[PDB]
Write a protein that binds this DNA or RNA. Structure first.
Lengths: 141, 43, 185, 262, 126
RNA sequence: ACGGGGAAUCAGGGUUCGAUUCCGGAGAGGGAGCCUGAGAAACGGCUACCACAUCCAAGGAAGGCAGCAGGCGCGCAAAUUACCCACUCCCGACCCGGGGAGGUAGUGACGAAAAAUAACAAUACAGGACUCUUUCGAGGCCCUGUAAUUGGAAUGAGUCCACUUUAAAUCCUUUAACGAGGAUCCAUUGGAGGGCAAGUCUGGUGCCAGCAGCCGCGGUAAUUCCAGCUCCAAUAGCGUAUAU
């Protein structure tokens, strides 16, 4: 059930150079089409303005209306949905605001009740969203 | 959206706004570990 | 093209399992007994004891009567006996594996000041060295992580400038005499 | 990339110069004298660190220019003049004379010698080179093209030149029963009798050597340098006599003298 | 006084005609006695003038004890004018340098390039 | 994807990374050609062409910051248009001039080593080895949890003169004059359902707000949300995002 020979080092090698492609944890990270469809250019964060403010429901077991934002990036000009993670911190978000967006916490997947949103908002017009909540900073009006 | 986005921070904003009391400065330093060792293994 | 020697490296190891209720419980039993500050003061010792056995083990893999083992091991044994953790004549490059954490902890200056009088509590000795009162046979040192060699084991006394030493009082006593003079008469 | 190199950086420079890492970036680049880089010793480093007569380049700058330094009989005037094997150097103001031969690890140990040994030197040959007009010619380690030698001079030999007019006197042939010191390579600076030269037509001719201490080693013919006849060296040797000691044995010597001179 | 100068690593630089040494101060707790006094005391131990003694680089140790510094002892006042580097000399002051600036000079030689060729054009302007 | 010396991770194998200060190669916006010179197909040298461009009397002239500082644009994202040639060596007709190569400064929580925020005592509570009573009662050498600075000693943070450091100053180091009573000199970042250390505590909210990496909590007693109190993790660091 193996090669195991002593002049076979090439076949053990051109087999594993072939069967690595079926490890989806490796096919994604080593094929140019996986990163291309990423709205980020592989970056950690990406700035971009806010072009509306919309809410999205939750999955079947538990009901709610998660609040979100329709952020358009400036890097690629794409359009993505960004969750606004905080308690009632949709009062500081406004149209044409240039918010900073980060990965949601599952390396390119949804999390929990939120359907189809993989992005959360960390800053809002160059002030930290945590700072606005706890009050340390203040967004000038 | 069906009718949403009207309520946001409904709970944070109607909870009572109670104030805090600052009495003892429990600085960590190292007497913390002196007494944090002396909560467990003194009894 | 700068001079700037950039050689540095960590000296502590983060435990693989963060919460165990038995590693946390026990490590305090070390900090509490020996008057440390934070877990780094313990893991740093775990690292030196890890290295000194990751080095001792490699020699044990090598057979005896060997050019590199016999010298490095004798040299390896030389520092341990010199530092105050192993008995002379208890050197065979095997009891090294029989060492435990506390043996490097017992030899620090902070603990050593406590055992040779010079203080009332193991914590009190620690504040003294940081107030620059204790001199290791010639020089006042304020480093409670000093690891004392055998020569410096019996040469530890108070300084010559300290208020506890043969010097003038500190600021507290000097000021009280002046403040007290108007206080009483 | 476009021509010669005129900046030698730090310990990228040869290791036997005994240099630091935090003396900035560069190192003195020898002036392309009578020896390769990887065998020489800049005259500047012989006056700051090996001797510690001076402090900086400047105090070395003013010494060599004041025309006190004497190398091979005629004074030099460049800060970085390459030194090399079997070179004699003299300091007339203080009154010492140095020999500059390799140690048992390879460091160009400081070696003070008598004025009698400060007259001559020992130089190996590289090719007997009969040239125009039927004139026999030689070449030596320090690029001395000597005309008109003793015809018996063939190869790998050692010559003795008075250091006023060259003019080889008292040569010793390469044989398989004579002392020889190894120069260059990992074996740098050991001494022993040859006892063999196993030829290899078309490659490096490997020369074994047995030491008077009973030990043995081997090198290639290039690294061999003959320094006397029989078991008698023409030159006095430093402490250790160029006899390699294992790091275990060298450890013993360190511990014994401890607390016995300071 | 209690300065208590001590000497180590002494060498007589005949090829420079000076003295090379290490000065080892032992101050029982003071302000690391200045270069003036140590130059004063060292002469009495060496039987010479305080004009010829020059010291450099006192780096005190920890704990207010032994303090180490270097010094060199020449023979002539002339000899210090060619064997001692300049900054070590004005440190007490017998030779103020040419120092005016660098960029002020550097700008000058460059703007000289635009008018170079005529002595009047060069020296007259600036 | 500049290659290599190397780097992170690890039981034995390995997997990933290497623009990055050392060695070697290519280049000065894209290409091509060439003079001087031993050594350039050099661009802080010339010649054209192309794109972008700066003065103009409209006739013409000049340039290449992928050098050190700077600003623009780009972005998730990267320093002050500061000092001099003293150590580093290099260049030159030369112990003597020049060096934004380099050093020195400033910014600097990328990162790494040591290390403050309390120590002591009597106080009155509090335990048990000790003390004596089978037993109650006791008085004492101790460990401490808490509260009064009750009280005298020790100190570094900070100011500030002088010395020391160094071309010139800068910080550490050394001796000054001051400089601690609880908010003085006020410690955080994340949690308390499970994994995973720690509240079946109180007020609010009512499948709402929201939390939650995952299993899941929220419809009147929420151990999970928002807060208060108490405790827990790491401690000048600690969460978040992505690559690994």
């Amino acid at each position: 059930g193996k090669c195991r020979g002593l002049r076979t080092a090439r076949k053990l090698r051109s087999h594993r150079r072939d069967q690595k492609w079926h490890d989806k944890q490796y096919k994604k990270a080593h094929l140019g089409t996986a990163l291309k469809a990423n709205p980020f250019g592989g970056a950690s964060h990406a700035k971009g303005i806010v072009l509306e403010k919309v809410g999205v429901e939750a999955k079947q077991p538990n009901s709610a209306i998660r609040k979100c934002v329709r952020v358009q990036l400036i890097k690629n000009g794409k359009k993505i949905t960004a969750f606004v993670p905080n308690d009632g911190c949709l009062n500081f978000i406004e149209e044409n605001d240039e918010v900073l967006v980060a990965g949601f916490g599952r390396k390119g997947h949804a999390v929990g009740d939120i359907p189809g949103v993989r992005f959360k908002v960390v800053k809002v017009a160059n002030v930290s969203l945590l700072a606005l909540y706890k009050g340390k900073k203040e967004r000038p009006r | 959206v069906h009718g949403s986005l009207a309520r946001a921070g409904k709970v944070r904003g109607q909870t009572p706004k109670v104030a805090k009391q600052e009495k003892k400065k429990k600085k960590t330093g190292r007497a913390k570990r002196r007494m944090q060792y002396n909560r467990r293994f003194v009894n | 093209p700068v001079a700037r020697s950039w050689v540095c490296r960590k000296t502590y190891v983060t435990p693989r399992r963060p919460f165990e209720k038995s590693r946390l419980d026990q490590e305090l039993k070390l900090i509490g007994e020996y008057g440390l500050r934070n877990k780094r003061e313990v893991w740093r010792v775990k690292f030196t004891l890890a290295k000194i056995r990751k080095a001792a083990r490699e020699l044990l893999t090598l057979d005896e009567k060997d050019p590199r083992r016999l010298f490095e091991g004798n040299a390896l044994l030389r520092r341990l006996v010199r530092i105050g953790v192993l008995d002379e004549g208890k050197m065979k490059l095997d009891y090294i594996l029989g060492l435990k954490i506390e043996d490097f902890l017992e030899r620090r200056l902070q603990t050593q000041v406590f055992k040779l009088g010079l203080a009332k509590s193991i914590h009190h000795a620690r504040v003294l060295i940081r107030q620059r009162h204790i001199r290791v046979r010639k020089q006042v040192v304020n480093i409670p992580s000093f690891i004392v060699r055998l020569d410096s084991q019996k040469h530890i006394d108070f300084s010559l400038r300290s208020p506890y030493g043969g010097g003038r009082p500190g600021r507290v006593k000097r000021k009280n005499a002046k403040k007290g003079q108007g206080g009483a008469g | 990339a476009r021509g010669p190199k005129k900046h030698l950086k730090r310990v990228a420079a040869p290791k036997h110069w005994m240099l630091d890492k935090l003396t900035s970036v560069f190192a003195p680049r020898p002036s392309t004298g009578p020896h390769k880089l990887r065998e020489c010793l800049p005259l500047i480093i012989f006056l700051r660190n090996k001797l510690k007569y001076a402090l900086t380049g400047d105090e070395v700058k003013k010494i060599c220019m004041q025309r006190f330094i004497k190398i091979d009989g005629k004074v030099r005037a460049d800060i970085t003049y390459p030194a090399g094997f079997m070179d004699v150097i003299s300091i007339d103001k203080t009154g010492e004379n140095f020999r500059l031969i390799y140690d048992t690890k390879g460091r160009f140990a400081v070696h003070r010698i008598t004025p009698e040994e400060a007259k001559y030197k020992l130089c190996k040959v590289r090719k007997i080179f009969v040239g125009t007009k039927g004139i026999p010619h030689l070449v030596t380690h320090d690029a001395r093209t000597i005309r008109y030698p003793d015809p018996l001079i063939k190869m790998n030999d050692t010559i003795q030149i008075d250091l006023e007019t060259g003019k080889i006197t008292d040569f010793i042939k390469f044989d398989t029963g004579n002392l020889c010191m190894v120069t260059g390579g990992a074996n740098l600076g050991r001494i022993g009798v040859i006892t063999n030269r196993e030829r290899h037509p078309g490659s490096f001719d490997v020369v074994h050597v047995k030491d008077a201490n009973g030990n043995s080693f081997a090198t290639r013919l290039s690294n061999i340098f003959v320094i006397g006849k029989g078991n008698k060296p023409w030159i006095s040797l430093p402490r250790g006599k160029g006899i390699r000691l294992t790091i275990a044995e060298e450890r013993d010597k360190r511990l014994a003298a401890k607390q016995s001179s300071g | 006084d209690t300065v208590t100068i001590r000497t180590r690593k002494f060498m007589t630089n005949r090829l420079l005609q000076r003295k090379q040494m290490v000065i080892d101060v032992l101050h029982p707790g003071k302000a690391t006695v200045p270069k003036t006094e140590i130059r004063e005391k060292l002469a009495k131990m060496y039987k010479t003038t305080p004009d010829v003694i020059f010291v450099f680089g006192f780096r005190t140790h920890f704990g207010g004890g032994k303090t180490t510094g270097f010094g060199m002892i020449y023979d002539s006042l002339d000899y210090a004018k060619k064997n001692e580097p300049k900054h070590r000399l004005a440190r007490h002051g017998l030779y103020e340098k040419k120092k005016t600036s660098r960029k002020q000079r550097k700008e000058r030689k460059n703007r000289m390039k635009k008018v170079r060729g005529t002595a009047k054009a060069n020296v007259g302007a600036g």
